[PDB]
Symmetry: C2
Subunit: 49 residues, 2 copies
């Protein structure tokens, strides 16, 4: 026998350029959350950045 | 016919004295959340009370 089979088993988002808001709400380990929030004002926080 | 039927259809907690933490995380209307959080320190917030 000879024959071929397709395979499409990849990330549903595989085609795309992906930007994510990733404020950084999520457990990391030793930092490197890679979040996009930042205290641009220098207040030290206490509220949404 | 004569006969009787019980009825027990009440709050599952009906028996008890209920204290709830109710920090106050929940939509109210015009206030009266009845929450137990308070800025006892007078900081104006920015962080857990």
């Amino acid at each position: 026998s000879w024959g071929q089979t397709g395979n499409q088993e990849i990330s549903n988002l595989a085609r795309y350029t992906i930007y994510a808001p990733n404020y950084g709400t999520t457990d990391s380990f030793g930092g490197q959350s890679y979040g996009t929030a930042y205290d641009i004002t220098g207040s030290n926080g206490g509220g949404v950045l």
